[PDB]
Every structure is written in structure tokens, then in C-alpha cells.
Amino acid sequence: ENHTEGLLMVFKDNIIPYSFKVRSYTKIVTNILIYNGHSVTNRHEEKFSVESYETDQMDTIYQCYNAVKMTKDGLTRVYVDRDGVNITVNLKPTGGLANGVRRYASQTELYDAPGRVEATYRTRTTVNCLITDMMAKSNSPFDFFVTTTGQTVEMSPFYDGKNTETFHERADSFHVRTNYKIVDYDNRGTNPQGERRAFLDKGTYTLSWKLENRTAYCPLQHWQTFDSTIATETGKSIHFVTDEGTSSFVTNTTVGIELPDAFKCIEEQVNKTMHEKYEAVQDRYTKGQEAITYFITSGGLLLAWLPLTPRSL
């Protein structure tokens, strides 16, 4: 006949992967040089990354340069849209699938006039600027993350250049900027709050996301809270029986009091809930202890226990 009341909260494992938002920049160049003069067209395209100075323009003012420069064995090739010159073009919203990614693209070339035929067929050059917004997901060990369109990056999302997180990509590709201003399309003309963004060059495109600490992901999730449980001691175990959910949780150890090791996330959550519940009940009860006690069930469940004692009015 050893019974004690209290308040109980049950936490379970987290299986939903960590998720965050990314944005991608790329430059697309297409060649229609194979006009088959000899009457069909055989065009091949290519994609390229974006440098730092250009990304600052796109993120804030939504403008890009329609000119790409490459290099190969000391040979450099420069192309312009419609064979023009170095100029600034705007980016406009582009329609797409409902509830998906959002794309901003610049207009293509004005025209593609025919040229010569036979060996030297008509050659056309076009360049486009693209911006895409999607989401990415990563799992518990944080070895890689995958974007929406299906592109994988072999790097932990929490890496910052001086941490111990996994980073198997090229060394001279990752750099992090501080006090970075990025604004949305609808509010061109307002300065937002500076943040810390991380950039990565994948050769074919560029990726950027807001850097954050590892304390933003937590491996435990709240399941239920019970208000009128009763703790009964059986000598070598403790039974927490509640008649609201009709459940009984049995722990292997009697003393328990195993303080959380790495599950320090819930300290703020349990502190608010227990304090809130006790206030509505403190009319006829007093706290029998000052510190919350933690146990672990035979199954994978974590319990927070705070005994309560009645007040002798």
C-alpha cells in the first residue's frame, strides 16, 4: 500500500529526418551549331556555376550578366546572348507545378538567325540565368543530405570549416559568409536582417543555405502527458499506472534518477509544462521534491517524474 501521485511525461524516438531550405544558382548555355546544312537541328547544351560577385547581385536586386567565360589549356571562350555584349538582364518568376519549387529565370535570346551551311552550319549561342528554391533532408548520423530534385551532397549540413563534422567534398569549394543580406522578390527595396550563409560549388550549379548549430536537431519527441498517474513500488520495480490512457509503464531500476546525457533539448519543454500544470493544481497539493527525476522503461521510452503530496488543510 505504497502509493504516490505526480505528473508524468513520456518521450519517444524521433524518426523524421532533419529538414531545411536551400537555393540554387546556375547558368545554362546552349549551342545549335549543328544545323545540318549538307535539314534538321542537333543542339547540345551545357551548364555552369556562378561566382561570388554575381550571387550578390541575384540575391538582392535580381539581376545577372549574360556572358560566360571558360578556360581550357590556356584557351578562353566567351559567349553572349544573341552574340551581344556584357549587359545586365533581369530575372522574372516562372510558372510551374503547384506546391513545388519556385523558379526565377531570365528571357532567352531575341532571335536565332540562320547562318552558313555544310561543314560550318548555322551556329547560335544562348545563355540563361536560373534560380530555384527547394528543401533538403538529412538523417541521424549526418553524412549527406538530398535536395528535392534528387541531388546528393556528401557533407554534413552543420559543417562550418572548423568543426569535426563529415566533409568529403573538394576542399577549395566551401566558404561561409557572415552578415549576408538576402531578400525576396516581393520586397525589393527593404533591408533584411544579416545572417550567416554557407556556399558550395558543385561544378554544374551552386548551393547555399543558412548555417546553424547542431543543437537545432534533437533525437527525442514528445508523445503524451498524463496528469494523475500513481506510482506503486513492487520491491524491484516501479509501476506508473494511469487510468486516463489506460496504460502502465514499468521500469527496471528502483532508484533511477538517471539524469539526461545528451537529451538536453527537453529541459525547456518539461520546465514549462510541469510548472504550468502544478500551478493549476497547487491549490491542494505541494511539491514533494525540487528536481525532476528521469527513468527508462523496458521499452524505449523516457519518463519525467515529479511527485506530489497533498496539503493537510
Epitope: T60, Q63, T88, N90, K181, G189, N191, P192, Q193
Partner: antibody, heavy 116, light 106 residues
Framework: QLQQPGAELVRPGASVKLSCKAS????????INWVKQRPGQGLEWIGN????????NYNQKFKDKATLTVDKSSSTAYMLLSSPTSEDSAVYYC???????????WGQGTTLTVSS | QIVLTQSPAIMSASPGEKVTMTCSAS?????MYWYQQKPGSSPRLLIY???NLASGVPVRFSGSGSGTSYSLTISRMEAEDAATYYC?????????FGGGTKLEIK
Amino acid sequence: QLQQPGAELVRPGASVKLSCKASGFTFTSYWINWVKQRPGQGLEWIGNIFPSDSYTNYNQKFKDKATLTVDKSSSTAYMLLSSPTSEDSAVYYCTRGGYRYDSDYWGQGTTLTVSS
Amino acid sequence: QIVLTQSPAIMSASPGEKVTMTCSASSSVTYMYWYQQKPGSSPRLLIYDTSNLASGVPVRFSGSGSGTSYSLTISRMEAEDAATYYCQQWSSYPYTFGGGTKLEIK
């Protein structure tokens, strides 16, 4: 440079236009903002036309009194006032915006004289 | 639509003492800018982002703040530092200015 001509007389009921010549910088990378400064009072914002575009964001109450426009070729901006009255005698400045710390060059200011 | 309130109106201060003017906003703002306008001239920028210094502004001028409370302070005031000072916001699209502060020497 950002120079503005002044010394103009306003006839009530007749629309007036103001010019703000911009030179020495790329005109398609910033914005022009027009501000009205009533003498003896604080400054007031009107709107901000975006060159290279047409994003003329206007004030919450100046829709019926303002009209912005630009000549990309002549690198110039203009302020059109519709049905001016005698209570709006003030000085108007054209300012350059931008998300870069480099500069935001304030204009000189055009005085407006409206009377009988 | 955020309205800026400048509680100080008349300084009438003499050289020798520090002077501080605070700008209060009805709502939260990301940053704040300070403009000094001498009579018969266009205003000039002094402080941007509530903590930085413009070009040509001497070390004396400085300010700080957070949320909806900001202020500017100076160290060695001379005769030429008697002008009007305005606080302007940027986050909300209507670029609302402030009441302004008059500084006098006596």
C-alpha cells in the same frame, strides 16, 4: 553626380514635371527615391521607381498626386504632379538607393513656387 | 507603417557635456539610420545599421541600440555640431522619418 534644376512657377490646375539628371554611374543598378521637404517640417517619402524595371512603389496616400517615369536612354527620372494646389510649396530631392554600403548620393533639391 | 518618435526636442546645450538623443519606434525595426541636416543644405548620412560609421564622419559620432530603442551619442561638441538630426527606418516599405531634434548652443 545628381543635379536637379529649380526655380519653377506652378499654376494650380496645371500639371508640373521635375527632372533629376543622373550620370557617372550605371543607371540600371540602383533606385531613384523622391522626398518632399516642407519648410519648417520633417522630411517625407513619396516613392521609388526602379530603373531597368517599372517597380514604382508609391506612398500610402500619394497615389492621386504623384507619377514617376524614367528614360533609360537619357538616364533621367521625372516626377509628375497632378492638379497641384497652393499648400504644397516645398523642396523636392531625388536620392539614390542601393543594398551596398558604398554610397547613397542625395540630390540638390528643386524649390517649388505656387501662388496666384 | 511604423511611426518614429523623437522625445528630445530642444538641446540648448553648451560645450563640455555629452548629449544623447533617442529615437523610439512603434514596432520592431531591423536597423536605423541617422541624418544630419544643416539649414539650407541637403542632409548627410552619419550612422548606418545603428553601429557603423559613414565616410568622412569623425570618430566622435557613434550610436547603438536594439529592438525599438536606439540613440546616438557624441563626445566633443563644437559650434558646428548644432543642426537637426533625423532617424529613418528601412524595413517597412513606407520610409517613415522621425520628428527631428534641434540643437542649440548657450
